[PDB]
Amino acid sequence: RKLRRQMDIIVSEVSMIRDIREREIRIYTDAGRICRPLLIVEKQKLLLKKRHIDQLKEREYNNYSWQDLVASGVVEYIDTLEEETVMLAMTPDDLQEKEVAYCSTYTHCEIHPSMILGVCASIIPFPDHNQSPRNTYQSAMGKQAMG
Amino acid sequence: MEPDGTYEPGFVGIRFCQECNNMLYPKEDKENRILLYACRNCDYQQEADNSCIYVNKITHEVDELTQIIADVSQDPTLPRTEDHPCQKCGHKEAVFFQSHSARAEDAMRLYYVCTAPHCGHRWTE
Amino acid sequence: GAKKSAIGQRIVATLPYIKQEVPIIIVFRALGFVSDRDILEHIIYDFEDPEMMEMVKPSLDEAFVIQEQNVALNFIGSRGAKPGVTKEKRIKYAKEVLQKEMLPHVGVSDFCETKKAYFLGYMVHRLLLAALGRRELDDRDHYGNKR
Amino acid sequence: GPSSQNVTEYVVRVPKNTTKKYNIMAFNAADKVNFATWNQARLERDLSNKPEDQPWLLRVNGKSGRKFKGIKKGGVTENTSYYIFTQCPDGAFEAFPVHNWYNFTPLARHRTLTAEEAEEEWERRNKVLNHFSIMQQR
Amino acid sequence: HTTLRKVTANTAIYYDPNPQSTVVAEDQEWVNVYYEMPDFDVARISPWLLRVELDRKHMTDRKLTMEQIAEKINAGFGDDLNCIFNDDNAEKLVLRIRIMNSDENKMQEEEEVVDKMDDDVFLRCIESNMLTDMTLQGIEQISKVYMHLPQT
Amino acid sequence: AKQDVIEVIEKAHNNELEPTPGNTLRQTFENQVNRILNDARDKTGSSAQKSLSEYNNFKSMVVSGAKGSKINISQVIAVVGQQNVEGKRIPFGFKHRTLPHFIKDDYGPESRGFVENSYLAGLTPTEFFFHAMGGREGLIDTAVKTAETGY
């Protein structure tokens, strides 16, 4: 993994999974796997610090970019097979307050939870105060509108 | 000679033919009234070791004694319980889980794996 | 009839371009590992458990009718192809199928014929685990198993 | 002594070109082979049923001695190399290249059940109904 | 529909051709219990021994007796299936089964038309039939099935 | 209700629990937790029904019998309640989990189904997704049932 964070093997590519109870290590580098970016947490706390943010503000006149952010190794790419074996905190807030609240073994964290929505579902405001199929009819109709 | 007790004689299906390296089957000696094991594909024969040739079932196989390798302690998605003192090592922070498997059977009984060294010991409560 | 009062362990194998189901043990004979201990080593590298050993045993019992690679090849040839009393060609064609057609991802030549034997054996192992039920039955729609 | 404290240091040589190809002969430990009980051996390429690609045939002692089959490994190494480190009478080390890796496995002196007869037919009839007698009728 | 398979904890097959010196020294007093049981053709009956262990909890629920099960199996299979059983005075329950042959005719005339499969292998088919087909108080085919309900 | 579920989990892990007749231990555990979360839901719904002022427009549509039912008022005012597919609680789609956000083996009501919030308070991210699973059953069933009755 350390090599992956350092990019001696391609992030977006290599998936690497260990199934401890079976003593197997599966690694995947074939095309076609769905994966998403997540923040890394380490020693019970987030590895990304606000100094990386100040470089991102700096991008308005500097070459610093999302790729640099991946090069710090503070974010990782996780496919659905690998996402099964991670312990994933919902939000920095929860990973912080924790003491004896739930657990402390987290390994990733969500860059923002509302990202689980697809393109059309994001137009619809307060989607969580709606009954779930109600959101599905809007995703069809929003795609149906004119402008 | 009592109702209470246990019986684990250690089944045997591994003492294959030494002459051609193939599986051995039980067979009779009607002259000596003794069990023998012979390879079917050759003349080789050899005396048995136990009178048992086959067993089936064993009730609620608590088979908790094996399978679960100590390494399971490393998994971050498994819960760390503050319930303490591995019975062996003077250390808390047991990892636990229920049962698993298709033969989860029906028990909900927790299985505990200590994660500290000075053991690697498995136990149930 | 009074065969084994429980056929629920007679493990067979479909293969590509084969008109008839064959028991896995023939394929192992066709790979050349006549030694039953060796086939048992490919199937289950933990012969310490009596229950696994009993699970395979009736599949071994079926194996006795064929006890050499050539004839086993003549079996797969005739069970798979159009009729051809040539015997030897039936063996050579079948030899090429095992070389080219079966588990091609594990190789496409003589020089990696051993590697295929472990992998076929791993499937039987992967199957036996489920058959003991100490192994979950794999979902139909888990996204980790999609491309 | 070596049981307490010892240090050894020997130069390592590589000859520009060996006078012979160096090969590996591997056996299964389960066969527990002891060359102490070998007195003669023959080693020849099986070739008649159809040379340097062809499998090995290992014939030990006389005709009644054990016969083994030698199968060639696809390549010596795919991204490395294997070398033999040997002790020389001067007190040096000498290193030799591997040219081939061969797997050698046991074969039965006389077994042969054969399916050419009607064993396949008997299988059609197979209700697990016999086992010894078929081996006798042979 | 309770099959013997539901009640059974485990089965074992032993080669014990000498009851008077049985392979389980602890089992030895029950053999003392049975010597008047056809002592003449113990030289004729087969030497293979089938031994079964039963769950006390299943046995309690079905409120059965060992003599009911023995009478069920003997009746179901026939005279060939020679049964004896352990004492009720234990928390465990075990049943010991041997097979009798056809006695007089087994003198090896032509070749004994059986094709000479081992008698044990015939015993596994007995145990197979014994697990699946035996229907103690299992008066029908209603799967396993029931439940009882109180209606108000 | 949540504290009482933890009591049932502790009874199950301690192996102090015994099965109900005609069922297995999981089915009993599941029957028992389901009885607790529904009973919780109905008690709280009945509380919400009690608090409605008589001037309320929402209470006037249900009581007239124009549109929607008493249960809708519960979900809007008090708590959405249990989510479920094919009848049972949300399946362990992952290895022994429902979402990677939870710990392995968490039968507690939140990791497996039951949403605490009301439609007014909003659903937390996980609560939101489990709700969409329960809403999908309703969308699919409409399409499948429509074809079969047609025939």
From Swiss-Prot, chain A:
It is found in: Nucleus. Signal peptide: none annotated. RNA binds at Q144. It comes from the Eukaryota. Component of the RNA polymerase II (Pol II) core complex consisting of 12 subunits: a ten-subunit catalytic core composed of POLR2A/RPB1, POLR2B/RPB2, POLR2C/RPB3, POLR2I/RPB9, POLR2J/RPB11, POLR2E/RPABC1, POLR2F/RPABC2, POLR2H/RPABC3, POLR2K/RPABC4 and POLR2L/RPABC5 and a mobile stalk composed of two subunits POLR2D/RPB4 and POLR2G/RPB7, protruding from the core and functioning primarily in transcription initiation. Part of Pol II(G) complex, in which Pol II core associates with an additional subunit POLR2M; unlike conventional Pol II, Pol II(G) functions as a transcriptional repressor. Belongs to the RNA polymerase beta chain family. This is DNA-directed RNA polymerase II subunit RPB2. It comes from Homo sapiens (Human). The chain holds residues 588 to 734 of 1174 of the full protein.
Swiss-Prot record, chain B:
It comes from the Eukaryota. It holds the Pfam family Zn_ribbon_RPB9. GO terms for cellular component: nucleolus; nucleoplasm; nucleus; RNA polymerase II, core complex. The modification N-acetylmethionine is found at M1. Its main location: nucleus. It is found in: Nucleus, Nucleolus. SMART domains: RPOL9, ZnF_C2C2. One of its GO terms (biological process) is transcription initiation at RNA polymerase II promoter. The keyword Transcription applies. InterPro entries: DNA-dir_RNA_pol-M_15_CS, Rpa12/Rpb9/Rpc10/TFS, Zn_ribbon_RPB9, Zn_ribbon_RPB9_C, Znf_TFIIS. GO terms for molecular function: DNA-directed RNA polymerase activity; nucleic acid binding; zinc ion binding. A zinc finger (C4-type) spans 17-42. PROSITE patterns: RNA_POL_M_15KD, ZF_TFIIS_1, ZF_TFIIS_2. Zn(2+) 1 binds at C17, C20, C39, C42. SUPFAM superfamilies: Zinc beta-ribbon. A zinc finger (TFIIS-type) spans 82-124. Gene3D superfamilies: 2.20.25.10. Zn(2+) 2 binds at C86, C89, C114, C119. The keyword Metal-binding applies. Core component of RNA polymerase II (Pol II), a DNA-dependent RNA polymerase which synthesizes mRNA precursors and many functional non-coding RNAs using the four ribonucleoside triphosphates as substrates. Pol II is the central component of the basal RNA polymerase II transcription machinery. It is composed of mobile elements that move relative to each other. POLR2I/RPB9 is part of the upper jaw surrounding the central large cleft and thought to grab the incoming DNA template. Belongs to the archaeal RpoM/eukaryotic RPA12/RPB9/RPC11 RNA polymerase family. This is DNA-directed RNA polymerase II subunit RPB9. It comes from Homo sapiens (Human). The lineage of its organism: Eukaryota, Metazoa, Chordata, Craniata, Vertebrata.
From Swiss-Prot, chain D:
It is found in: Nucleus. Induction: Up-regulated in response to enterovirus 71 (EV71) infection. The modification Phosphothreonine is found at T114. Phosphorylated on Ser and other residues by TAF1 and casein kinase II-like kinases. TFIIF is a general transcription initiation factor that binds to RNA polymerase II and helps to recruit it to the initiation complex in collaboration with TFIIB. It promotes transcription elongation. Belongs to the TFIIF alpha subunit family. Heterodimer of an alpha and a beta subunit. Interacts with GTF2F2, CTDP1, TAF6/TAFII80 and URI1. Interacts with GTF2B (via C-terminus and preferentially via acetylated form); this interaction prevents binding of GTF2B to GTF2F2. This is General transcription factor IIF subunit 1. The chain holds residues 5 to 180 of 517 of the full protein.
From Swiss-Prot, chain F:
It is found in: Nucleus; Cytoplasm; Chromosome. The tandem heptapeptide repeats in the C-terminal domain (CTD) can be highly phosphorylated. The phosphorylation activates Pol II. Phosphorylation occurs mainly at residues 'Ser-2' and 'Ser-5' of the heptapeptide repeat and is mediated, at least, by CDK7 and CDK9. POLR2A associated with DNA is specifically phosphorylated at 'Ser-5' of the CTD by CDK7, promoting transcription initiation by triggering dissociation from DNA. Phosphorylated at 'Ser-2', Ser-5' and 'Ser-7' of the CTD by CDK9 (P-TEFb complex), promoting transcription elongation. Changing T28M: In NEDHIB; profound; decreased cell viability. Residues 124-151 are annotated as: Bridging helix. Changing I140T: In NEDHIB; uncertain significance; moderate. Changing M61T: In NEDHIB; uncertain significance; severe. The C-terminal domain (CTD) serves as a platform for assembly of factors that regulate transcription initiation, elongation, termination and mRNA processing. The trigger loop allows entry of NTPs into the active site, switching between an open and closed state with each NTP addition cycle. Belongs to the RNA polymerase beta' chain family. This is DNA-directed RNA polymerase II subunit RPB1. It comes from Homo sapiens. The chain holds residues 709 to 859 of 1970 of the full protein.
